[PDB]
Design a binder for this molecule. Structure first.
Ligand SMILES: Nc1ncnc2c1ncn2[C@@H]1O[C@H](CO)[C@H]2OP(=O)(O)O[C@H]21
Ligand SMILES: Nc1ncnc2c1ncn2[C@@H]1O[C@H](CO)[C@H]2OP(=O)(O)O[C@H]21
Lengths: 170, 170
DNA sequence: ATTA
DNA sequence: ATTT
């Protein structure tokens, strides 16, 4: 009755081509999947919406993209996934990289440098270190890379069963 | 050596055509003027910078443009002038309207209704009440109107004398 | 409406 | 390059 899978993604980059091609496919395997479309902004961290599904979910599946470093809601929300993970390691994380290399995620260089070049003029001098030391550890787990050739269809089918297999076999 | 005039204007609307046309002319009347160029943002209200120049000035001249209520910094900056005025009524205000009618600013209608249509989704429901009641009072005092035809070179000189006349005679 |  |  509660949520079992919680997603997360960029705003406009991958909201209507691959993320959607997954959520529909997942519902055809009978598992209630939670994704949110309201941009929040009504504060700094809303209550019984995001913060509800975070502690209720089971298998966090963050979909890092190429511009995932700009929207200040995304990072400081991901800093809550990996922080809640280190408390109880019973739940897992299955990142799915996208277009970008799996080397510009462990050092925030390359396509992210312009992002943290302007985020350092507004926020604290230590909060930024709280994002990087949390964004880095995500780039060390397992994950399906998707180059410019891989057919963005079977990857969805191959990655749905790997999420359903942790439900039937328990 | 302290400030005697403090301005405030919309950003990319009236920064490089009329305000600078006026700021130089004031500098040829030997009166030290203060305008700020950095976008600030670094916090909620900077300490010994903007909030210092308010108490040091003497003749506030807020230049209400056409979309002066969209930039979230401007309003809560202007709400600071009219409050400092009522506590120690030694200083004055000489607003200079621009494009906008003086009847679409005493009721927030028209080109401003679109601005206050979305601020109810982001900020607190009471802070808006204090701006709506502070933006109205400014639109009651004196003020040179400048339509679409008035020679903006003539009003600059005419508005220079009215500022200097309040200094020599003490 | 959107920018966001 | 802003800017939420
Ligand atoms: N303007 C927005 N820009 C970028 N991401 C957004 C925006 N609004 C919502 N999201 C994302 O919806 C997701 C629901 O869990 C959540 O994941 P996120 O990456 O923290 O960023 C949010
Ligand atoms: N990007 C900007 N957006 C809106 N207002 C700006 C911007 N940059 C400067 N200002 C305004 O410069 C003024 C300095 O006294 C200050 O008054 P303001 O009305 O708070 O709006 C500022």
């Amino acid at each position: 009755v509660e949520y079992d899978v919680f997603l997360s993604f960029r705003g406009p980059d991958t909201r209507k081509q691959f993320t959607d091609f997954l959520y529909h496919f997942l519902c055809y395997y009978k598992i209630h999947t939670f994704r949110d479309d309201d941009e929040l902004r009504k504060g700094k961290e809303i209550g019984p919406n995001l913060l509800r599904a975070i502690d209720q979910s089971k298998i966090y599946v963050p979909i890092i993209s190429s511009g995932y470093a700009d929207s200040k809601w995304c990072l400081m929300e991901l800093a809550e996934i990996v922080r809640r993970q280190e408390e109880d390691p019973r739940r897992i994380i299955l990142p799915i990289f996208y277009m970008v290399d799996p080397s510009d995620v462990r050092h925030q260089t390359g396509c992210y440098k312009k992002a943290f070049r302007k985020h350092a003029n507004k926020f604290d001098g230590q909060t930024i270190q709280n994002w990087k030391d949390a964004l880095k550890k995500v780039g060390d787990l397992k994950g399906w890379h998707i180059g410019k050739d891989d057919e963005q269809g079977a990857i969805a089918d191959k990655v749905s069963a790997d999420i359903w297999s942790h439900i039937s076999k328990e």
